[PDB]
Amino acid sequence: QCCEKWTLVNDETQAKMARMAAAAAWGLGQWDSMEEYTCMIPRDTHDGAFYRAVLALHQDLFSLAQQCIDKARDLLDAELTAMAGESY
């Protein structure tokens, strides 16, 4: 479904696609496809950091990887500090 529909799609829908497209490429182990999709994910999201952090480790960029993991945790503050208060 990803490969068929890119040029047919808008930039709003593009950003809601890549989180699933990268997951899919990663699942299938096709790393060229995975790099294209991961760039389309926004940097401000938890996932955006995480998928850059994976493509860091496949290409062996451990300083860059470690940066992205910490940046990912920083963005996960908001999500945990929301839901951790009321119930585990």
Q: Left (φ > 0), alpha (ψ -120 to 50) or beta: where does 46 sit?
A: alpha
Q: How far is CA 83 from CA 22, 48, 50, 70, in A?
A: 26, 20, 20, 20
Question: Torsion over CA of 25, 29, 34 and 35, rounded to 10 degrees?
Answer: 180
- What Å resolution does this PDB entry report? 3.2
DSSP classification of residue 59: T
From the CB of residue 61, how many other CB atoms can be counted at a distance below 10 Å? 15
